[PDB]
């Protein structure tokens, strides 16, 4: 099982399918896929947990990676049984996801709190409670209350994608702190990020 606030499960939220891969709502998938490549962690089919998953060493720590393949609003149908099977407490889980309330190129590490309208997080907090960590990857907001679907299922313009990709690359360099349980320092150094 997990140990204290050393992060040992990193989840990335998104939808399956090439048609959603480049959309804002898959920001969490981008981060976990990039982290997997960085550390040479294989993401392999995991039918038992309705996902794609991997396990590997990050900076001397055994860490599991999970991409639910449930569709975003059913993400809990992968995250919850996976974390239960492996006896991973919420305190040791990092969930990376798109954040409408932050600009592209803003990234913040948060512990606790609600789903903030995110339909993936909405499917997870009722089960495991809120005390997991979140890598909130700004995607910016749409022009109103009803363009939300269209915005999260859109592919960002290149300037915004460049800002998100630089923020995501920064965060990758801070995962060493998270897997070592240095959450306060990783929150300091992630939240300080600026694009330019």
């Amino acid at each position: 099982g997990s140990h204290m606030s050393n992060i040992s499960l990193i989840v990335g939220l998104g939808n399956p399918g090439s048609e959603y891969a480049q959309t804002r709502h898959n920001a969490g998938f981008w981060f976990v896929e990039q982290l997997a490549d960085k550390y040479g962690i294989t993401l392999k089919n995991d039918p038992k947990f309705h996902g794609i998953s991997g396990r590997g060493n990050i900076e001397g720590h055994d860490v599991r990676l999970l991409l639910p393949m449930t569709y975003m609003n059913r993400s809990g149908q992968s995250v919850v049984p996976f974390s239960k099977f492996y006896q991973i407490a919420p305190e040791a889980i990092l969930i990376a996801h798109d954040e409408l309330d932050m600009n592209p190129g803003v990234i913040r590490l948060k512990t606790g709190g609600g789903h903030g309208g995110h339909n993936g997080l909405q499917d997870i907090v009722p089960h495991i409670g809120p005390n997991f960590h979140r890598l909130r990857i700004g995607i910016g907001h749409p022009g109103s209350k009803e363009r939300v679907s269209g915005h999260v299922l859109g592919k960002a313009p290149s300037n915004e994608q460049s800002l998100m990709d630089g923020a995501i690359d920064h965060a990758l360099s801070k995962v060493k702190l998270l897997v070592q349980g240095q959450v306060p320092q990783a929150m300091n150094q992630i939240n300080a990020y600026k694009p330019a």
Side-chain angles (χ1 to χ4, degrees):
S2 64
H3 190 46
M4 308 196 178
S5 296
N6 288 188
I7 295 314
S8 59
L9 171 56
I10 302 179
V11 182
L13 301 182
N15 284 304
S18 56
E19 69 274 31
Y20 291 99
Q22 309 171 52
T23 67
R24 296 173 170 115
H25 221 27
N26 273 37
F29 279 23
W30 305 338
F31 173 80
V32 176
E33 288 168 359
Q34 290 171 44
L35 184 59
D37 189 59
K38 173 177 177 75
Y39 289 102
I41 304 178
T42 293
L43 294 172
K44 69 251 172 317
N45 188 15
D46 193 342
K48 171 177 185 95
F49 295 113
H50 310 102
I52 279 165
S53 69
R55 179 191 178 181
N57 187 311
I58 301 181
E59 310 284 357
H61 296 270
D62 186 41
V63 178
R64 288 175 186 279
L65 300 183
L66 177 64
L67 310 172
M69 293 291 141
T70 50
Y71 290 87
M72 179 70 88
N73 67 4
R74 293 185 160 186
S75 295
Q77 307 202 216
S78 178
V79 172
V80 180
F82 189 105
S83 65
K84 269 223 247 180
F85 183 89
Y86 296 108
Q87 296 207 317
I88 305 165
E91 294 83 356
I93 298 182
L94 178 69
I95 305 196
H97 61 89
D98 54 304
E99 173 54 71
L100 275 186
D101 187 38
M102 292 175 357
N103 286 336
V106 181
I107 189 149
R108 294 221 252 277
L109 186 71
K110 177 170 191 177
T111 300
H115 54 68
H118 190 288
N119 68 160
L121 296 176
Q122 180 177 18
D123 203 50
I124 289 167
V125 178
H127 305 290
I128 62 173
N131 297 322
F132 58 88
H133 312 282
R134 306 96 177 271
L135 183 73
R136 296 179 69 198
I137 302 165
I139 60 162
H141 215 277
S144 281
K145 324 299 191 334
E146 57 189 303
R147 333 221 129 39
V148 166
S149 178
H151 181 74
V152 312
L153 303 176
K155 172 180 162 72
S158 62
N159 187 60
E160 292 177 23
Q161 191 68 58
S162 284
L163 288 167
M164 294 184 292
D165 290 346
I168 284 166
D169 173 80
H170 179 69
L172 291 167
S173 78
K174 302 311 175 177
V175 174
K176 161 174 184 33
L177 292 170
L178 290 167
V179 305
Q180 293 167 175
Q182 288 168 284
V183 180
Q185 183 170 348
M187 189 182 300
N188 282 349
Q189 290 193 4
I190 294 173
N191 289 21
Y193 180 74
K194 309 154 154 218

